């Protein structure tokens, strides 16, 4: 349950492909969508 | 909640460690006691 998409709108992994837009102040830029795991997670007893 | 209850609606969003509701207030107080990021919370209180 510690999987997140670089674009928060796309909930599932199959959706997280292509390019998405960032709206930061006084600019509009486009970056890749990436399906990533959080840096600290709970996947096995060692990671926990 | 009396001092900072209604003034964490900043232009960048409401912080998770807000004093809006009671369950949110308890966690913010608990976090300060453990000492993690108590200065960042204080910065929000001063800015508010």
């Amino acid at each position: 349950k510690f999987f997140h998409c670089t674009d928060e709108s796309k909930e599932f992994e199959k959706d997280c492909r292509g390019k998405y837009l960032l709206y930061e102040k006084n600019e509009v830029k486009a970056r890749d969508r990436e399906w990533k795991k959080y840096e600290f997670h709970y996947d096995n007893v060692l990671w926990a | 909640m009396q001092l900072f209850g209604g003034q964490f609606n900043f232009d960048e969003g409401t912080p998770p460690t807000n004093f809006d509701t009671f369950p949110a207030a308890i966690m913010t107080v608990f976090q300060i006691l453990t000492g993690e990021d108590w200065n960042e919370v204080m910065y929000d209180g001063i800015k508010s």
Partner: peptide
């Protein structure tokens, strides 16, 4: 989940990787 290099506030904890940096950017 704000992107890297976007203005950030540490209390938000919304930064995608790591945390909000000293200079105020992810």
């Amino acid at each position: 989940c704000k992107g890297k290099g976007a203005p950030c506030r540490k209390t938000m904890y919304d930064c995608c990787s790591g945390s909000c940096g000293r200079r105020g950017k992810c």
